[PDB]
Design a protein around this ligand. Structure first.
Ligand SMILES: Cc1ncc(COP(=O)(O)O)c(CN[C@@H](CO)C(=O)O)c1O
Ligand SMILES: Cc1ncc(COP(=O)(O)O)c(CN[C@@H](CO)C(=O)O)c1O
Lengths: 398, 398
């Protein structure tokens, strides 16, 4: 045995999945991507319904032009830390775009969303302090807790009551960070932020909200679930990513706290990595600024989401949410075999959705996840519904 | 007090540095970048000698063309995990380029170099296993140790003897990972890998070598210090980055271990982050493949390094290394004031080098770090030497 012997179980599990005759759902290659909604997968034209490209920004002509210009003018990379040689014109641009987007004085960009959560959580809360998080928080939030030296307190999934009880049992004096998400990505349901934030404040805690799955399409300014629920000016830190609505890679944290900039002085995942390529921060800047006034896209996205959610529910699918509360629609299935057969029938028929990842999914839960795009046409949505009807009936789900 | 009160000391320290009248060395903005060797900083044309762009690939015409084409054909981002919707044509291309570059069957690309170290170390070595690392290892290697649940064993900087003693005191049965770097980035000196690897193997340990600061210009195939020292076929895992010789963002690990691919099934920093934008992996692919035969660049780089190292030593500067052993030249100074005055005089005279970062530098050590580029001309190197002579004499360093 050696260091890789520990993976023998996972290897056997993947082979067991493949023994069923399905395409490996975790090795899909997009050979060509024609648009935000169309790709070629396994030599077949396929509608994309599992890409989390909520506002279709990845093919926006202004976004693409900004990226090409940045490559030409500034080259392919910075090769350095933001603290040394890695801050170019476009890095200053992208941080100001975020300040303008969120109405904050502070904005710190990280090289990935994962690293923003890893770094902000492990840097803000130290030894003798507390991080209080939802039991089903994103992996990056859990990894930030592991990276730090704080006391970690999980509360039962989606319970305002359990947050309140768990917070209330902690000592009063030490500083505390409550970490919440606006939209939770497994089922696409929304957090009761208004109520949870009131509880956090009662107990003197600071609040961090991850708005990765809401940017550009929740709240009057598209700032997130917290804005939609009336919490403008009440959230200490908002963490987000460039890899959803914005359409590239990178992470960020925004805040009005007067000492917020000091995070750059301490945060290891900010300091000890190369800054993003000029093209990446240029595309992000342009996308973020367009997202401030992308009203037609926002309306199309929600229209499409309501149509898909309403249609699948009407057909008899069991969904992760009773009402259409985000741009994620989760279809719940009875076993791994049913999920596999459904996913394959959809793929073979020309539709890509996500199969739940075993590392992300609790045992005994089986689903497919759909993500709506502002650039889906009403026609594509009806085509998708017809494909779900055909596959669902053929597999015996409905 | 709140969660940011812990930064009050760091804030005061930065202000103390600024009280000296220097430009903030940790807030430099590259307003324009004309080439790998020239920028506009504070409205002034400046020679770049602190960018770690060893092979000048960031402005290579093939590299830039590949990036622009990828933006046009595939859009600005993938918006998803490699395990789901994030594997495009160009991700498969970049992993094959690495296999060809290193002569390995295995290659896993991560969204940053930092995340490659974080993930590979925390995933390979589990509870009851050991990670044995040099005391002065890169922050990302230390952070990977923190992220995992292994026993961490540091050995005294640059000691084959201490590695041997520390390893020998551990129980024989548990699996062990020895982590080394080829070139250490603080002083630009080289590790005695041949001897350290023989020690690791005597004790039955697996070896990971970080070749971030050697790719493309050490060894017959440019694979790194390990190749230069005759260790081809003896290193279990090689970790690297795209942010130095390659010229963009991203991380990687390569290996011939038959179970290596299984890392994709387990590694949280691989799974739970968006894959790199098409343009980024296209630029990396093109750069990596060009680096396989970039002999003129490699010769220019080493010629320039020897000229700079030899010239600064000749003038009376105290350097971090007695002989020119890498493309990093560290100039050692007596105190923070001397380092500050030197750095400012160089900047005002039209040269950018790095001031040592306080988070990276041990107390009582003060240096400036120069990084050579294959695209520096002999003329620029002599200009740089003249600037060091003028600044060094004016400040009293020489
Ligand atoms: C030996 C070594 N290994 C790994 C990394 C991380 O690579 P990344 O910067 O591409 O994430 C670095 C980064 N080094 C630079 C950032 O690019 C730094 O300021 O620390 C490194 O020096
Ligand atoms: C709520 C939340 N917060 C943070 C992140 C990390 O952002 P990044 O993917 O841009 O690093 C994700 C990533 N989510 C995707 C990868 O992009 C995943 O497969 O998990 C997220 O869902």
């Amino acid at each position: 045995r050696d260091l890789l012997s520990k993976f023998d179980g996972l290897i056997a599990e993947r082979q067991k999945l493949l023994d069923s005759g399905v395409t490996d759902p975790f090795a899909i290659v997009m050979e060509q991507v024609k648009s935000p909604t169309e790709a070629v997968i396994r030599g077949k034209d396929t509608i994309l319904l599992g890409t989390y490209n909520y506002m279709g920004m990845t093919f926006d002509p202004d976004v693409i032009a900004a990226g090409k210009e940045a490559l030409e003018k500034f080259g392919s990379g910075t090769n350095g830390s933001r603290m040394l040689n890695g801050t170019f014109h476009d890095h200053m641009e992208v941080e100001q775009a975020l300040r303008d987007f969120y109405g904050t004085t502070g904005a710190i960009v990280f090289s990935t969303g994962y690293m923003a959560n890893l770094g902000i959580i492990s840097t803000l809360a130290g030894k003798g302090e507390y991080v209080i998080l939802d039991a089903d928080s994103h992996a990056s939030i859990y990894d930030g807790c592991q990276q730090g030296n704080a006391e970690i307190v999980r509360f039962r999934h989606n319970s305002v009551e359990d947050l309140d009880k768990r917070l209330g049992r902690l000592p009063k004096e030490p500083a505390k960070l409550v970490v919440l998400e606006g939209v939770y990505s497994m089922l696409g349901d929304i957090a009761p932020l208004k109520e949870m934030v009131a509880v956090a404040k009662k107990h003197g805690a600071m609040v961090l909200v991850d708005e990765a799955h809401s940017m550009g399409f929740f709240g009057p300014n598209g700032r997130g679930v917290y804005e939609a629920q009336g919490l403008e000016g009440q959230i200490d830190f908002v963490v987000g990513t460039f890899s959803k609505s914005v359409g590239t890679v990178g992470g960020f944290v925004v805040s009005n706290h007067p000492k917020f900039e000091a995070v750059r002085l301490a945060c290891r995942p900010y300091i000890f990595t190369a800054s993003l390529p000029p093209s990446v921060v240029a595309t992000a800047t342009t996308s973020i600024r367009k997202l401030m006034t992308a009203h037609e896209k926002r309306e199309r996205l929600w229209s499409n989401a309501r149509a898909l959610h309403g249609g699948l529910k009407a057909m008899g699918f069991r969904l992760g949410t009773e009402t259409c509360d985000s741009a994620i629609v989760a279809v719940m299935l009875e076993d791994q075999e049913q999920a596999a057969m459904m996913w394959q029938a959809l793929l073979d028929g020309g539709l890509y959705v996500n199969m739940a990842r075993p590392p992300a999914t609790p045992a005994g839960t089986f689903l497919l996840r759909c993500s709506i795009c502002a650039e889906h046409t009403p026609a594509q949505i009806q085509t998708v519904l017809g494909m779900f009807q055909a596959a669902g009936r053929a597999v015996g789900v409905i």
